Structure 1
């Protein structure tokens, strides 16, 4: 604020309080695995080379 001449009006604003709300925006992405991939990953046959 600027202190002014006694005849000019003015205001008493020292502070004001303002609230901001968070804006939500989720993201997503898929990835896919085949049943054969899961079989060979999980069920490790002793088997061969």
Structure 2
């Protein structure tokens, strides 16, 4: 606040309170797997080059 001369109205005790918040914005980029790649990764077949 700030002082003024006599004859002018003044400014009293003043406080202000604000409150921000939080948005929720998830993402999802789901990838596929071709089923041949999944059935050839996690199991072992015969020993050919």
Considering the TM-score relative to the shorter chain, is it more than 0.5? yes
* TM-score of the superposed pair, with normalisation by structure 1: 0.69
User: Structure 1: which 5+ residue stretches go unaligned?
Assistant: none
| Shift, 1:14, TM fit | 4.8
Provide Cα deviations, 1:1-49, integer angstroms capped at 9, x if missing partner: 2211233222234532110111221111110002110111111224211
Segments of 4+ moved more than 6 angstroms = none
Query: Which is bigger in relative contact order (C-alpha 8 A, separation at least 6)?
Result: 2
SS at 1:40 equivalent: helix
Runs of 5+ unmatched residues, structure 2: none
